[PDB]
Amino acid sequence: MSESIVTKIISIVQERQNMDDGAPVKTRDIADAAGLSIYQVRLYLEQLHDVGVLEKVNAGKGVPGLWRLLE
């Protein structure tokens, strides 16, 4: 293991939607809590997405994108 910051991100994702109750996590908010840039963050999120960890809760284009865990 070496990702470290990525694990922190995953923790933030779980704990956020936990506090949002019925709403998923916000791409920005993950960057705020972690203290990172939107691009860097969405990279980690998208990789975790395609491997099954996270799912894209969004209408499509023109939206900030909401992230929710499943696998």
Query: Residue 37 maps to which CATH number?
Result: 1.10.10.10
* 48, 62 contact by CB (below 8 A): no
Say how far apart CA 31 and CA 22 lie, in whole Å. 21
Task: Copy the structure tokens of residue 22.
Answer: 């019925």
Strand 25-26 vs strand 54-57: parallel, antiparallel, or unpaired?
unpaired
Domains in the chain: how many in total?
A: 1
Rounded CA-CA distance 5/30 in Å is 12
Query: What range defines the domain where residue 38 resides?
Result: 1-71
Integer angstrom CA distances of residue 57 from 2, 3, 24, 35, 68: 28, 24, 7, 22, 7
Q: Cα 40 from chain centroid?
A: 11
Cα angle for residues 22, 63, 40 (degrees, 5° grid) = 95
Q: What is the DSSP letter of 8?
A: H
Neighbours of 63 (CB within 10 A): 11
Q: How many CB atoms lie within 10 A of CB 12?
A: 19
